[PDB]
Amino acid sequence: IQAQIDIFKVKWDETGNDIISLANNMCKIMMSMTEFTRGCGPLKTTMDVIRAAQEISLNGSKLNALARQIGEESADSQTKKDLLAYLSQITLYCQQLNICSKVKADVTQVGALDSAMSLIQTARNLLTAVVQTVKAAYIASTKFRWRMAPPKKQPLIRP
Amino acid sequence: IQAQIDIFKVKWDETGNDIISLANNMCKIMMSMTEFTRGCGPLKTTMDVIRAAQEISLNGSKLNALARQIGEESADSQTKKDLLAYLSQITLYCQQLNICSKVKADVTQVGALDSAMSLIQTARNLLTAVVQTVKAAYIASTKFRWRMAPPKKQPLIRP
Amino acid sequence: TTALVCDNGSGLVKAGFAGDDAPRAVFPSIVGRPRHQGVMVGMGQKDSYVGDEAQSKRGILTLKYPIEHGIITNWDDMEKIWHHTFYNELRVAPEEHPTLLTEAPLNPKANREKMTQIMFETFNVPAMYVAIQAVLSLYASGRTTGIVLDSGDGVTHNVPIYEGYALPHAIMRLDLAGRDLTDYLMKILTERGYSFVTTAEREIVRDIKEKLCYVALDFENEMATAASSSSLEKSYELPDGQVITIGNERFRCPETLFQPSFIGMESAGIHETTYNSIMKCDIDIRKDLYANNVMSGGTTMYPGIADRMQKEITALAPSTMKIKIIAPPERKYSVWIGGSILASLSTFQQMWITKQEYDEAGPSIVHRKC
Amino acid sequence: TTALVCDNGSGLVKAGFAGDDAPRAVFPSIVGRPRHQGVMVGMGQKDSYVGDEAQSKRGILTLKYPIEHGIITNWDDMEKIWHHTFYNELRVAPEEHPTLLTEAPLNPKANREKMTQIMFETFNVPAMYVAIQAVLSLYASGRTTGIVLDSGDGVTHNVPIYEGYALPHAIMRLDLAGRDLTDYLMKILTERGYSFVTTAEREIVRDIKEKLCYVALDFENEMATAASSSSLEKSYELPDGQVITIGNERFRCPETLFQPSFIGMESAGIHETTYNSIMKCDIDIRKDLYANNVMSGGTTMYPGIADRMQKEITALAPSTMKIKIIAPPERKYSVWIGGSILASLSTFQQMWITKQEYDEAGPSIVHRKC
Amino acid sequence: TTALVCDNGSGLVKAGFAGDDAPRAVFPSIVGRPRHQGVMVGMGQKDSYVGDEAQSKRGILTLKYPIEHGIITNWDDMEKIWHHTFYNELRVAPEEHPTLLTEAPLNPKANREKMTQIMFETFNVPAMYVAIQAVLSLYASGRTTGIVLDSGDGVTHNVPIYEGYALPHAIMRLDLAGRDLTDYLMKILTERGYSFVTTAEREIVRDIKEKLCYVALDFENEMATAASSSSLEKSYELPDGQVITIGNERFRCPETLFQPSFIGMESAGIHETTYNSIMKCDIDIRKDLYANNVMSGGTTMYPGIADRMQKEITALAPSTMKIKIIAPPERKYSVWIGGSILASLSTFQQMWITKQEYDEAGPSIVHRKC
Numbered sequence A, B: 001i002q003a004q005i006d007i008f009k010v011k012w013d014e015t016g017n018d019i020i021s022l023a024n025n026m027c028k029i030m031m032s033m034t035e036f037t038r039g040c041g042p043l044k045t046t047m048d049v050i051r052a053a054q055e056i057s058l059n060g061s062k063l064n065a066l067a068r069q070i071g072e073e074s075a076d077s078q079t080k081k082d083l084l085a086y087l088s089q090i091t092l093y094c095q096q097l098n099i100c101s102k103v104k105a106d107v108t109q110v111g112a113l114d115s116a117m118s119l120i121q122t123a124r125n126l127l128t129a130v131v132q133t134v135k136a137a138y139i140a141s142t143k144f145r146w147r148m149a150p151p152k153k154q155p156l157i158r159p
Numbered sequence C, D, E: 001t002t003a004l005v006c007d008n009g010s011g012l013v014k015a016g017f018a019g020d021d022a023p024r025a026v027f028p029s030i031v032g033r034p035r036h037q038g039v040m041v042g043m044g045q046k047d048s049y050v051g052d053e054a055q056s057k058r059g060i061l062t063l064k065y066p067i068e069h070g071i072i073t074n075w076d077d078m079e080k081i082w083h084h085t086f087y088n089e090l091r092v093a094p095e096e097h098p099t100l101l102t103e104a105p106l107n108p109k110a111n112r113e114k115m116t117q118i119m120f121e122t123f124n125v126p127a128m129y130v131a132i133q134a135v136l137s138l139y140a141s142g143r144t145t146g147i148v149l150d151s152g153d154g155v156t157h158n159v160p161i162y163e164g165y166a167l168p169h170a171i172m173r174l175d176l177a178g179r180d181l182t183d184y185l186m187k188i189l190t191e192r193g194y195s196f197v198t199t200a201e202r203e204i205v206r207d208i209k210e211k212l213c214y215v216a217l218d219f220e221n222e223m224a225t226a227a228s229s230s231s232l233e234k235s236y237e238l239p240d241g242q243v244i245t246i247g248n249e250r251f252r253c254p255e256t257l258f259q260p261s262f263i264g265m266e267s268a269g270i271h272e273t274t275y276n277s278i279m280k281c282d283i284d285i286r287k288d289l290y291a292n293n294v295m296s297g298g299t300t301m302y303p304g305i306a307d308r309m310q311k312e313i314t315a316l317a318p319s320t321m322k323i324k325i326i327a328p329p330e331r332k333y334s335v336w337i338g339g340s341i342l343a344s345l346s347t348f349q350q351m352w353i354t355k356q357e358y359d360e361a362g363p364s365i366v367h368r369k370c
Ligand SMILES: Nc1ncnc2c1ncn2[C@@H]1O[C@H](COP(=O)(O)OP(=O)(O)O)[C@@H](O)[C@H]1O
Pocket: C007, C008, C009, C010, C011, C012, C013, C151, C152, C153, C154, C178, C179, C182, C206, C209, C210, C211, C297, C298, C299, C300, C301, C302, C332
């Protein structure tokens, strides 16, 4: 997921920087929570994971607004419809993250890892639906009437 | 089908008359059932069609026996193999006529035209396999070591 | 002697003697076993009831079909079914009669190998033969050129034949049949409020399907008619005196055949399956296959299936060709009548798999002979 | 305004406001009516007590659940329950709030039609919506790909979902739930000597079941342990000071779920039902359904049901696949939290059944919209 | 600028930039559309998934190939595929790149006319060109004199070329290719018991064919070896954990190429087709065509096809001539590498169909230029 953003190099070019920055923050928090899953990471308390999930939800709302602006700026095409579909998915995931974070907070306060497993899963679903929102928004704003490098050569022989 | 028999004019010449008579009876019953299909004919009840089908089956068994006798009387050739193939076809058709006639009789007794359609179809298949049995038997018994007229001239121009 | 013809379908077993025109034994292919607790001494010694004696006592049994989608899943139960058929229903010693069994196309090979092994080692028949069901249906239809739609309780398959030469690359076997329609009828019956959940209640729903369900000529128009007025509602009385009433479920259950997406299946309906099987055959014989659409099997007996199938195929075939569906009134027993025609033939008596051949070559002889 | 989320289960009513994370009102769905004779003037004017005020006064009442197996058998009592929920517990005028009701799958259609009619004609809500319960449980589980076992007091049903696309042909609704376990616990409690016969005593037995009963990982080993020693016996104190003691009935009551033959039902347990629902789905998504077994509803809160269900499914699934059962600590309220997530969505606000649409199309609009 | 090279095969789309040595995008040419029911709001807005995103989500889709036997049956879906290739995979605006498309020989003329019209009117490319696939395979093989067997997923065709002068009367196009082998593998897999019926299960069977199937050097000896011992059985694990085992179906599936009578086709195998194409050429060049049998396309990658084809041709050719089959390890991408060689040539840049020429002469210019 990180590689799809990492091929970005420096409408679009006006709100593009904000969106790429938000996606990068999302990926940073995402691997924060992933490292929590693996055991060693910046955040070690389930409360910290809930705070990180709420942060990802807030970034998702912001990126959704920016991508909606780009989407209505652009012209009718297939990539616009893909972008709108991904925006709906981001909306659903953000709502899930909010309410589930509040529920897990209350459950933890009333008195472990499996509490944060579902939050990590929902945030990972959200992130997967963002790297397809930046690409669709970029293509819809640019190719129709930052940068992404052309894809790498496919191997001729696969062992 | 009637024309193929109608070119007969008066081993073979010992059992030939029996076979030609049986084939002529078959054709007479066949057009009886055909006229039933067209609406006007000697027989008008489906029971009559079933009786006619059983009669054709009996004639088929008799002609099969006679043609088998001629076939084993004759000598090895290609027409003998054609005759044996047609005999097998006649056997299959006769068995079908018997069992299907009994089935249709029971179906009609327990309480229309489509009941007799398949019997007419099977009898017509049987008849087509007889006019090729009389000719093959005649040639195998005669030409190798009644009559059939030489074929008519083919048109030079076909409009 | 005289040959047996046992057409062990997926839902009904139909046995008889070759040369006849009707089966002697026609009983369901179920094997019930009691599940409650027996309290009277001497009653309850019998561990399993087979066939018709498990359909009468179904109130206290768990009926289990041994054959499931044309493939024999349970072999001990199917030995029980065959023993019942041979001894208690037909009342013949198998040692003195050849047996002609039937089987759907495209089944596993272990199926034929184990039917042959069981007949030659457990029942000691002197000869046997396994014949595809649609070929026998074309035998009993009185023709030699047609495309045989053969529904049933397990499978629904086509076999296009032109003048005694079957086309094995155009055989289209679909696994949608009567039992799937029964289960779908149970599902859509839950809408009205009636919940049938047990196996005996599967049999009640099967009887509802047989008595009431029919096939609509035009589905949308019939749904509109059923929603507008209550002229389509018909009532059925359950075995305990209750009365049910199904108005819209009557043609929705058999519509699964023409839209197999009702039960989540992807494949095309039986009309598109028949048409695709026709246009896989050689171009010269499609005209003769169009005019002879022999329909067989129990499931093809819904009131109005011939007219609907003719309408559906005629909209696919070219406007010139003559489409007509052949639906004999006895089509439920067409496969068995074909077995009677085949097994009693003079030509056929050299094609039995004799016991000596099985001893020489093992159960793999059935693949060469059949 | 702010939408209501009323999850009127078969045993408990859980209402609240959309967007929150916990219900405001959680009271039993009972309607008691006094049966004895009133002798003091002025006491006894109230004909029926609803919810929590009929659970306190149950000594002199005949409690009657209006919803029975997820299907609303009594409609006047359920109007009473809804009136209680709206006015006396939540304290909101229904005219100003849309209401999101929940319903088990495969219920009668008259159920949805009459819930819609009552909401739009008696309570005058401006909009409503009826959502399947397992879909909402998957909403609240934080995923979009899983198979949702949702027990309860009325029914136990599965809904397999893969990436937001539910598979309606693999929904398996079983009518074995908490109330059947309560009745079976009463039955097996009669063995020790304790006879609970009345409705208030049904509530006492329900409390015994909640406090003490658990699910055994291995049934035979636990029966052997319970017979060999008295280490499994735990005591409960009745409302009149008597002390009971149940040692072997603790895991026999919830074992009815995994062997529904204890109460005479034929159907397979919840483990086989879940596995059959998994292998009715398409082959490519079974691996993702195996790893997300969301369990919801009250009845799935027995101590040790997740471990036992994982053991039972792992013995059925192929040895390679990874089985893990998801049992959130709040799973009793998972359906309602899903209702909060769904009703407060920005996307969802075009899917309410507005009052104008109901006026145009009648109570049959709920089948199109929902 | 730099020219695109889009080799839209019947089964895979392989695009890239001219002058390179490997494609950038290699994804299947499928367009799935969801068929189940969406229950979560916001999931299900996307009507159709194209290429690699429909191969991941195939559990809930009906994959449909737009190109079928090298002929584009569906044009809206193929516009979807081209849009995907240009924008989402290669990420280039088509307005700035000439495009070199490929096409099998002996296709309909409307095929080229509509590819040209779509490129010049929907994607607004500045230039294009349509090249026969076997010519490009001979480009990429590093020669100018050979007979190019080019199998694939749609068609299998030969193009005999001698020193840059193709012989159009000896081009032999056969419509037997990888997809027919997949369908035949499904058919013969039904024998063991495994029934794959859906489209996603077609993709599973395709993967089985790629992983396990090979070509036997001597068919009868290999059948004898497979029947005598179980040394040829290899196991494959399905996406839901089940394990299959195919021993005899491994070399029976690719034997359809050398005996097309397995699937009911009349035409001769690929060895007789190649030999007949050789002896339709002039007598002086048959010696040079015998020694350069370039094999291309995906379907020619079965383990042991070069040795078997050499054995089959050597038995037909005169005993003196030297037969050797050229099978590069990269032969799956030989057509595209040939497109890279052709499109980047200095000589070739006067042979593009410029947009001005298309405006002057309409879509019938492709027949003159190509
Ligand atoms: N009159 C009828 N109308 C509709 N369906 C029927 C009727 N009779 C039988 N069926 C269906 O056909 C099935 C029986 O088919 P059958 O002829 O036994 O096929 P097979 O012998 O291959 O099992 C039953 O399961 C039933 O659902």
